[PDB]
Write an enzyme that holds these catalytic residues in place. Sequence first.
Site, mmCIF file in Angstrom:
data_model
loop_
_atom_site.group_PDB
_atom_site.id
_atom_site.type_symbol
_atom_site.label_atom_id
_atom_site.label_comp_id
_atom_site.label_asym_id
_atom_site.label_seq_id
_atom_site.Cartn_x
_atom_site.Cartn_y
_atom_site.Cartn_z
ATOM 1 C CG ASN A 50 -2.235 -1.423 1.083
ATOM 2 O OD1 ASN A 50 -2.434 -0.988 -0.353
ATOM 3 N ND2 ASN A 50 -2.875 -0.883 2.179
ATOM 4 C CG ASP A 134 -9.818 1.960 -0.555
ATOM 5 O OD1 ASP A 134 -11.145 0.515 0.212
ATOM 6 O OD2 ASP A 134 -9.757 1.704 1.140
ATOM 7 C CG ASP A 152 -6.186 5.266 1.621
ATOM 8 O OD1 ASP A 152 -5.455 4.602 1.153
ATOM 9 O OD2 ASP A 152 -7.106 4.641 3.061
HETATM 10 C C1 LIG Z 1 -2.069 12.676 5.697
HETATM 11 O O1 LIG Z 1 -3.217 12.217 5.105
HETATM 12 C C2 LIG Z 1 -4.050 11.131 4.997
HETATM 13 C C3 LIG Z 1 -2.868 10.748 4.881
HETATM 14 C C4 LIG Z 1 -3.568 8.831 4.418
HETATM 15 C C5 LIG Z 1 -4.574 8.645 3.203
HETATM 16 C C6 LIG Z 1 -5.785 9.724 3.546
HETATM 17 C C7 LIG Z 1 -5.298 10.750 4.974
HETATM 18 N N1 LIG Z 1 -5.655 12.106 5.187
HETATM 19 C C8 LIG Z 1 -6.283 13.093 3.969
HETATM 20 O O2 LIG Z 1 -5.755 13.051 3.354
HETATM 21 C C9 LIG Z 1 -7.617 13.927 4.759
HETATM 22 C C10 LIG Z 1 -7.376 15.262 4.099
HETATM 23 N N2 LIG Z 1 -8.332 15.950 5.264
HETATM 24 C C11 LIG Z 1 -8.851 14.987 6.425
HETATM 25 N N3 LIG Z 1 -9.068 16.293 7.273
HETATM 26 C C12 LIG Z 1 -10.338 15.375 8.425
HETATM 27 C C13 LIG Z 1 -11.422 16.727 9.107
HETATM 28 C C14 LIG Z 1 -12.012 16.093 10.189
HETATM 29 C C15 LIG Z 1 -11.624 15.141 10.370
HETATM 30 N N4 LIG Z 1 -12.611 14.162 12.191
HETATM 31 C C16 LIG Z 1 -11.747 15.295 12.568
HETATM 32 C C17 LIG Z 1 -13.325 15.210 14.312
HETATM 33 N N5 LIG Z 1 -13.710 13.638 14.462
HETATM 34 C C18 LIG Z 1 -14.645 13.137 15.726
HETATM 35 C C19 LIG Z 1 -13.880 12.423 12.964
HETATM 36 C C20 LIG Z 1 -12.478 12.916 12.177
HETATM 37 C C21 LIG Z 1 -11.394 13.115 9.592
HETATM 38 C C22 LIG Z 1 -10.638 14.218 8.803
HETATM 39 N N6 LIG Z 1 -8.484 14.105 6.761
HETATM 40 C C23 LIG Z 1 -7.824 13.072 5.985
HETATM 41 N N7 LIG Z 1 -6.887 11.800 6.230
HETATM 42 C C24 LIG Z 1 -6.872 10.572 6.867
HETATM 43 C C25 LIG Z 1 -7.852 11.741 8.381
HETATM 44 C C26 LIG Z 1 -8.058 10.321 8.952
HETATM 45 C C27 LIG Z 1 -8.076 9.176 8.533
HETATM 46 C C28 LIG Z 1 -8.300 8.452 7.513
HETATM 47 C C29 LIG Z 1 -7.978 7.406 7.293
HETATM 48 C C30 LIG Z 1 -5.875 7.529 6.138
HETATM 49 C C31 LIG Z 1 -8.271 7.102 5.219
HETATM 50 O O3 LIG Z 1 -7.697 6.319 7.725
HETATM 51 N N8 LIG Z 1 -7.245 9.823 6.599
#
Ligand SMILES: COc1ccccc1-n1c(=O)c2cnc(Nc3ccc(N4CCN(C)CC4)cc3)nc2n1-c1cccc(C(C)(C)O)n1
Length: 260
Positions: A50, A134, A152
Amino acid sequence: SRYTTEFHELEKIGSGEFGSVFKCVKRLDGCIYAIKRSKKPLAGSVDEQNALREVYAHAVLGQHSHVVRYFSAWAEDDHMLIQNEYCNGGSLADAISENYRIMSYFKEAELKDLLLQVGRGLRYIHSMSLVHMDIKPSNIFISRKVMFKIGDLGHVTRISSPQVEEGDSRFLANEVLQENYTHLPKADIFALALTVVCAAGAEPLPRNGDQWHEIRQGRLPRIPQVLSQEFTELLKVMIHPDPERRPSAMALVKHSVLLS
Ligand SMILES: COc1ccccc1-n1c(=O)c2cnc(Nc3ccc(N4CCN(C)CC4)cc3)nc2n1-c1cccc(C(C)(C)O)n1
């Protein structure tokens, strides 16, 4: 540490086997980023494959309004860090759960907007001779006007020499389970239709059984809202058992139903 020197952590936004993701401010530019920090993958593991797919995708793809922007990746003591754009609206999966809690869902116009925007991201990825493999609510991020962006890239592969890792069985097209990788762009289209059906308020998609097979026979799952016939026929043709019958991402973004 480059991570602690260049950035300040503001909020943990993700956690799991993939490691942890934090919302950070970069000190130099005052901008907000999403940074994932994970352990060095074990040799021979799916995690290693991955990480390799993601490095390739990050080097090939250019910036696109509907793909989460990639900025940098570096190692710090056997840990890998990846710095991406921060999408302030979280994932489409969490937006769907929030809608369920308030007895709501994306209405028809919002679902066509989601389908078109994610479709534009897929048009770009496919035009670069890659497939995502995915697509699902947890991998669609929201920036708030609302912008949907594909994230992702860990399962991204080349159409000319596909390497297909295990996908989420809820979104998997039958031909991919059959190990037929000759129309992979159409597996992304099939997953996108099921992602939209999730946004429409459907019940949790099945992973196997009679219901999984019913969907792969071209039958849409039930949703708690009435959609127009022009729109329902678009979703139904996106899950046709024949991939050649599903619209390409190019065709999907030129569709007057979505454009209007
Ligand atoms: C560096 O990043 C990544 C690297 C690899 C794959 C995906 C990501 N990746 C992005 O590229 C991305 C861009 N923006 C956001 N914004 C965001 C804002 C709020 C929240 N909330 C907050 C309030 N909480 C109650 C719930 C979650 C969640 C996400 N997140 C991101 N990511 C991300 C975040 C979480 C999980 C994952 C995977 C890896 C897919 O499992 N990726």
